[PDB]
Design a protein around this ligand. Structure first.
Ligand SMILES: OC[C@H]1O[C@H](O[C@H]2[C@H](O)[C@@H](O)[C@@H](O)O[C@@H]2CO)[C@H](O)[C@@H](O)[C@@H]1O
Ligand SMILES: OC[C@H]1O[C@H](O[C@H]2[C@H](O)[C@@H](O)[C@@H](O)O[C@@H]2CO)[C@H](O)[C@@H](O)[C@@H]1O
Ligand SMILES: [Cl-]
Ligand SMILES: [Cl-]
Ligand SMILES: [Cl-]
Ligand SMILES: [K+]
Ligand SMILES: [K+]
Ligand SMILES: [K+]
Ligand SMILES: [K+]
Lengths: 376, 376
């Protein structure tokens, strides 16, 4: 079980590749094992590996968005990684779960992302602690013609409205332990339906504009016409550039005392079943996911990582670090793919005045029949 | 006209880069000019070039989807390319137009794509020539709960329903010659409303299922439950493997005696304004888009190219070659980004029974509104 001469890794982008080269160069000085890096987009790595791995041209470790976890495993491409408690130490717990399928840890998280609550201090001086407070700010600051809104988020997209519709006891697929049951949908629960009725109420009160897309909301927020905006960290720098000290960022507030959890997206390192040096591949994977490495990663890339012990020096990103510890993984199973469009359609219908129970009942029916078609 | 030591090109993906190293290895033997290839995905190239070009570290030529032509030019990143009549010979005419902005040719088309009409010969023996017989096939082969449909396409998505809604004299943005006028929209013209009513009638007659997504439609077609399916060429191998000689492929039919024209998508090579060797970059661009190079390309990649003198050996792809010469470029201006979601929403509403004139009137007003906010 001694060292091989080389280990290959599939990195997502030229930017990350340049960063992991530096890191792996140090790995080579420490261990003597050379590391070959290949730039393959994460969106193309799963298809590519299914072809290259069986022919001996695949990598020892590769990189994917966590929602591909079940599919990667089911195809016999992603191998189980057995880890020590000491090796798991410092990793975001829900991030690990996001990369766990059939009760097996299939990857280590490198990058995590969620939404958070941005606010314009010139319009909202204090960080909203409750949803009732966010609503109160919506009521005060929303002006009809002036394009001024107290509260915005892309409520027609399930990704964004998720935390406003699903509480801790609600679910998409029922979890009978770690196993999502694909035949038990919670999309049309009494509680989700009530939250969806509230969402429609926000549309009825004029708090959420029907015509605006997520990109319009971004523009409006930058223009200084929006008090509160729930979105991802993608435009942090330009929001900081535009607002300076007036840019506020906070975690999602509590909803009736229970804290809101946005979707958690995770991207990270998988072990190839076709790797012939699984011990050392794992060793390299741990080295590139160490506190040291991922701290340098957050410093140099301004992204939140899968390590809770990594600390950005940007207080705005510190908020997303916290939010990442209080979030819910997008189900990592293939059937989750069937959920997005019907819930998106339901959300569009809700915004247009459709009875929310009917909208969600129809989405649930549609998801059920689509899963059967694509996954007998 | 005196050669540089090296030329740099940004390629979209590892697979394409492997193909262009071989071509450029030959280029270097002919000219003596070294070529450096870097793998940067086309969705990341504008942003990357925006930052690297000014620092003297950008490429000589880069690769984008034609939809970014206007933006690339407005930011002073893409340079005009002066071309001979003989240098233009063999290029798909609409593909060139897709890459032409402010009356300037800004790129040469490498890859093109449109939808076409697939049909299962066990259900539909002959290639349908007219929309009227597409419908007749729909009336005859659509059966309630056997999940059998004579006709399918993702009518909720504007990219797919476009040819069914817009005829030759209809338009998104009015073309005052070659340049689009962002303030004159045609999305709600009488003729388009009329086609939208026809589309609603296909939902009312049960020809198009409301619950199905594109991915479901793909599944149903592969199960042998669908007579006719309008979609792109992306799964052509899977369909061939499944049906063999029973896979029919034809161009979109005539509608009222006129050719239905789907959207044309083009991807290709732009010339960086920051290149210090524009003459020779142009030379390299012409070499990598020659009949010889693109013929080799279609052979190894199974993609349709921007050259009409390139012929695939696959008869199913020959159909796509022809379709690409009878298509309409997606408007290549930034304002087109505001069009997609509102038209998608209107299509969804139409599928749900909303009055099509209202649906399209609201989309039009929303687009007008969103364009003003994002481009003031
Ligand atoms: O349309 C459904 C779509 O939603 C999610 O995509 C997110 C993405 O994760 C974020 O990075 C950001 O761009 O917002 C997107 C909104 O769609 C799912 O992750 C994706 O799988 C799904 O198709
Ligand atoms: O958001 C809509 C989207 O429409 C077009 O995208 C097409 C794409 O060109 C095809 O390759 C295929 O995958 O269908 C896509 C839509 O489902 C536009 O190209 C794109 O700009 C636009 O965002
Ligand atoms: Cl509350
Ligand atoms: Cl000439
Ligand atoms: Cl006809
Ligand atoms: K944003
Ligand atoms: K689906
Ligand atoms: K397809
Ligand atoms: K938009």
């Amino acid at each position: 079980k001694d060292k091989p001469n080389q280990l290959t890794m599939w990195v997502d982008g030229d930017k990350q590749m340049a960063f992991y080269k530096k890191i792996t160069d140090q790995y080579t000085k420490k261990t003597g094992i050379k590391v070959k890096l290949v730039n393959i987009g994460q969106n193309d790595q799963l298809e590519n590996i299914s072809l290259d791995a069986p022919a001996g041209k695949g990598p020892d470790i590769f990189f994917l968005a966590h929602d591909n976890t079940g599919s990667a495993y089911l195809q016999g491409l992603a191998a189980e990684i057995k880890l020590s408690k000491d090796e798991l130490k410092g990793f975001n717990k829900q991030a690990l779960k996001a990369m766990n399928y059939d009760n097996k840890q299939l990857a280590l998280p490198a990058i995590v992302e969620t939404t958070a609550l941005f606010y314009n201090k010139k319009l909202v001086k204090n960080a909203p602690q409750t949803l009732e407070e966010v609503e109160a700010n919506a009521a005060k600051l929303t002006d009809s013609k002036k394009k001024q809104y107290g509260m915005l988020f892309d409520a027609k997209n399930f990704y964004f409205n998720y935390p406003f519709l699903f509480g801790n006891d609600d679910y998409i697929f029922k979890k009978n332990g770690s196993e999502y049951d694909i035949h038990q949908l919670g999309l049309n629960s009494k509680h989700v339906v009530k939250n969806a009725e509230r969402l429609q109420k926000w549309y009825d009160k004029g708090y959420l504009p029907k015509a605006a897309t997520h990109d319009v909301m971004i523009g409006l927020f930058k223009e200084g016409k929006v008090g509160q905006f729930v979105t991802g960290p993608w435009n942090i720098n330009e929001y900081q550039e535009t607002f300076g000290k007036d840019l506020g960022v906070t975690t999602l507030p509590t909803d009736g005392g229970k804290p809101m959890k946005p979707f958690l997206g995770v991207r990270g390192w998988y072990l190839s079943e076709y790797s012939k040096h699984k011990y050392w591949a794992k060793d390299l994977m741990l080295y590139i996911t160490s506190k040291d490495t991922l701290q340098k990663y957050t410093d140099e890339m301004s992204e939140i990582t899968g390590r809770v012990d990594v600390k950005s020096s940007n207080p705005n990103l510190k908020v997303f670090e916290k939010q990442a510890r209080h979030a819910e993984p997008m189900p990592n199973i293939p059937e989750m793919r069937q959920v997005w469009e019907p819930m998106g359609n339901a959300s569009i219908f809700i915004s247009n005045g459709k009875n929310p129970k009917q909208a969600l009942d129809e989405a649930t029916n549609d998801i059920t029949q689509n899963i059967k078609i694509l996954h007998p």
